[PDB]
Amino acid sequence: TVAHQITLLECVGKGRYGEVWRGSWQGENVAVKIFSSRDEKSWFRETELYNTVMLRHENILGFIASDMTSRHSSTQLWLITHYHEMGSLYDYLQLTTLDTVSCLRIVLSIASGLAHLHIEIFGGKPAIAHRDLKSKNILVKKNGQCCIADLGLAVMHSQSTNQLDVGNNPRVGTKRYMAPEVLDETIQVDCFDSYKRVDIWAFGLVLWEVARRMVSNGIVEDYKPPFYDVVPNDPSFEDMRKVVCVDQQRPNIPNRWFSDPTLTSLAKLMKECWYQNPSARLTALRIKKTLTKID
Numbered sequence: 001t002v003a004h005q006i007t008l009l010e011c012v013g014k015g016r017y018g019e020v021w022r023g024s025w026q027g028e029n030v031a032v033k034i035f036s037s038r039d040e041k042s043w044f045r046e047t048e049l050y051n052t053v054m055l056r057h058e059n060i061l062g063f064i065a066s067d068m069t070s071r072h073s074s075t076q077l078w079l080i081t082h083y084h085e086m087g088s089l090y091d092y093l094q095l096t097t098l099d100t101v102s103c104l105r106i107v108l109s110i111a112s113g114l115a116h117l118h119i120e121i122f123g124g125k126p127a128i129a130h131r132d133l134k135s136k137n138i139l140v141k142k143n144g145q146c147c148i149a150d151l152g153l154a155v156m157h158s159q160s161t162n163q164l165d166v167g168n169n170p171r172v173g174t175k176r177y178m179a180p181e182v183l184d185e186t187i188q189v190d191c192f193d194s195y196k197r198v199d200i201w202a203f204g205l206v207l208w209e210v211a212r213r214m215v216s217n218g219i220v221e222d223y224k225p226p227f228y229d230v231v232p233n234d235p236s237f238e239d240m241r242k243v244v245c246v247d248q249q250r251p252n253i254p255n256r257w258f259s260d261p262t263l264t265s266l267a268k269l270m271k272e273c274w275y276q277n278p279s280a281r282l283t284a285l286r287i288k289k290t291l292t293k294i295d
């Protein structure tokens with residue numbers, strides 16, 4: 001049962017991460033991620049998280065089950081979750097432009113999901129850093145809010161024991177979105193705060209991607225990924241470090257943005273996610289409060 005109770009209907013994505021399928025469970029739409037054979041530790045970590053923690057939130061991909069199963073005479077690792085037909089924020093930002101209300105809805109939902117991850121709840125969940133946040137890791141829901149997915153690189157911290165749980169995963173984050181301290185390998189790995197600060201850096205990149213797609217003064221930019229103009233597709237590790245650490249570049253913020261009320265708040269936020277000093281960066285909770293106030 002659990003995975004034998006599921007019919008894989010159509011495969012909506014294939015990539016390094018493996019495969020994502022739309023499928024039926026009880027005649028219900030579910031997402032089914034089938035992990036690539038290279039990536040069993042991400043499956044194990046995510047199964048470990050969603051099983052040992054009460055991790056449920058509007059803006060976090062809703063867990064249904066994890067399972068092992070045979071197909072084509074080989075073991076497959078499955079993670080089954082709610083299904084969101086609109087797909088990834090990354091693909092959404094190419095299929096449409098945004099007004100002010102829908103841009104703010106999107107980024108605030110993301111900040112809310114991320115704050116919920118970052119914040120320990122007592123008697124309950126530990127603090128959780130995501131460590132691979134990106135537009136391709138964020139699902140758009142029918143109601144226009146988003147939810148965060150792909151918890152396989154997650155790190156946890158509990159105040160009761162003061163134990164940092166970094167797990168055992170050789171996988172590293174998407175290179176395009178790696179904060180400088182990850183690229184120049186100076187991140188203080190023993191301090192949980194360092195990982196929250198990595199999620200904030202990545203959140204600023206996503207915030208940048210979204211803001212760009214908001215119409216202001218009747219105009220809008222084509223979708224482009226962070227640093228699209230200084231690194232190739234599938235950027236390499238040294239590709240990113242030279243741009244981020246040596247040149248210390250940031251995605252460009254048009255000056256005009258500071259004449260638009262909404263874009264002004266957004267551009268101020270992103271700049272305070274990109275401080276090269278990780279301790280200078282806003283926290284997720286502060287981002288949520290700020291966006292909650294915007295109009």
Ligand SMILES: CCn1cc(-c2ccnc(Nc3ccc(N4CCN(C5COC5)CC4)cc3)n2)c(-c2cccnc2)n1
Nearest residue numbers: 012020031032033079081082083084085086087088091149
């Ligand atoms: C690869 C990123 N990931 C997306 C999902 C995920 C979770 C829940 N629901 C959905 N549904 C969905 C619907 C439509 C589309 N499409 C949109 C447009 N289409 C265009 C062709 O060019 C782009 C591409 C595909 C994609 C996904 N996906 C998951 C996942 C799944 C299970 C467990 N853990 C994570 N990982």
